[PDB]
Amino acid sequence: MKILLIGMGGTIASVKGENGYEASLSVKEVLDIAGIKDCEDCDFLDLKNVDSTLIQPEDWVDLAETLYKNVKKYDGIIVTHGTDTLAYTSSMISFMLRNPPIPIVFTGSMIPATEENSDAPLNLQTAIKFATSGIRGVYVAFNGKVMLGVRTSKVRTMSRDAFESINYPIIAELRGEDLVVN
Amino acid sequence: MKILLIGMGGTIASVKGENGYEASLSVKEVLDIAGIKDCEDCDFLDLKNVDSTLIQPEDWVDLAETLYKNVKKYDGIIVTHGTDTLAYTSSMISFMLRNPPIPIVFTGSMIPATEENSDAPLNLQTAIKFATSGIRGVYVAFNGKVMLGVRTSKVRTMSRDAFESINYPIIAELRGEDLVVN
Amino acid sequence: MAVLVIKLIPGLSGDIFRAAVELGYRGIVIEGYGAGGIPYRGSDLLQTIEELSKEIPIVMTTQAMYDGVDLTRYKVGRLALRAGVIPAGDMTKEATVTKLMWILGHTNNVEEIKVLMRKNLVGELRD
Amino acid sequence: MAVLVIKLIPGLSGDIFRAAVELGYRGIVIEGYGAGGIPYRGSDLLQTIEELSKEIPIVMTTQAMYDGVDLTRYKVGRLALRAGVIPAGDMTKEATVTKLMWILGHTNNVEEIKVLMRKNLVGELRD
């Protein structure tokens, strides 16, 4: 029931102005604007606020250190991330944190959390439900599916169904309020 | 009703020995071993007998010249080809032969025509049915589908359903003895 | 003529693109992330492209299988465009590579190549 | 350390691989066709790999999205193996690149890297 949410930026947290500026929400702001009010005991940590296209290998070191110092203190961790290099990060973190004691769930959205039709609420609810499972490891939640993080690829560039599990079964799939694993 | 079949090699024409040699059937041998007996007026031309992985840009020049000197003499042309670079060839030929007067259909198989469970008969029947349509252009037939040749990609490496039309509707799909275009 | 296709990965530098140009490659395709773009901080890749894109065509497609690129959609895209990157739109990777090859076969004028790559020649592209 | 990912296309030569090694790249991934392999006639690519694969790991994955590689399935595969190419099995391209990067972070022994790449470390590979 105790969850840590770590922000890295991405479209999910994106906020655009008419002045031509591009700003970014913190993780807590993302959850609140996405309308997740059922997050009972949740902490928040803002590690980065970048377009994921900017991600470099040094960022994976930072993220892994951060994860390593929190895996014992939480029952689950969620990392919000841009979709562009999300599967790269989830892959590298999988090699860096061999055998996490908890679920570590990467997610994001194709449409900013600030828009009315965003996929952010579905993705966050999915990640949250899975961070409460007892299933240890590194995963990606997107479009109602939970996929093994080291078997995930971005497959579509302009769709809500942006990710797939490649050559491996999907871990779980949302059906109502239920994550189903078969 | 007058069709030219051009062989380039590939798995479809592959024949392996216990001596460790690898041999290749000509196009006519492929059709006959695949059991296509309904090919009324068909000519045959063997341009190459190679694993398609070997294809280089100079081969596209040869193939295009060959095609250019036959497009007027036939109602349809079929080219048998290895699956590895099939979509490359069908793409380049599409730029080289702008506006062919006839259908030009690339095809092949994941399983050699000599095996009992081969996809060769389905692929060849599909290509033949489409070479008899009045629909001009460069296309790929595979697994019962006809796809625009310049929108085709190899998507699977170990399946009969090896190709897809990317960001474009499938041209036609087999249902019985019928090619359906919607 | 000779084309080089390079996948964009985190931390990829511009030095191999220089080497490619020096080696006599007449075109380069970059498979970017998502709808396409070049990282503007964290590497010299963007600066390198600004320079090279006026000497040979630099084409951007996507590493994803479906939906293609749209360099107007994001800042990383708009800067790639500013830097002279030619978008591949919704073309397949096979169409993108072969189309570039075909074009290079009868012009090396980068701005001419740019126009051709963006024009639907035979059904490969929505222009 | 630094990894380079190159898509195999018809007529691709070995010269850019030499340049990559000379530039100090510690690993190279090749996205081949289908179940994987290197053309044995028509280019100097295979000969170049025979040489370079003992200095840095050369990894082979596929350009296709599903089913991965199997270098034992075809002659072009078996010669790639003979030439010292490390297969990526059924790994994603993201797992392949990042796994190589991670390994290179604590050894540059090519034969050691070879073993690691072929071992299922965390669920990324069927070994």
Author numbering:
A (entry chain A), B (entry chain A): 1 to 182
C (entry chain B), D (entry chain B): 200 to 326
Question: What does the study report here?
Answer:
Variable temperature solution light scattering and/or SAXS experiments have provided important findings about influence of temperature on protein shape or association levels which expand our understanding. Previously, we provided a detailed structural and mechanistic insight of thermophilic l-asparaginase from Pyrococcus furiosus in its full-length (PfA), and a conjoined functional version (cPfA) (domain architecture shown in Supplementary Fig. S1). SAXS and crystal diffraction data analysis brought forth that despite lacking a 19-residue long linker which connects the two domains, namely the N- and C-halves (N-PfA and C-PfA, respectively), cPfA adopts a solution shape and crystalline state that is comparable to wild type full-length protein PfA with improved specific-activity. In conclusion, the findings reported here provide structural evidence in support of temperature induced higher order oligomer formation conferring stability to thermophilic proteins thereby regulating their functioning.
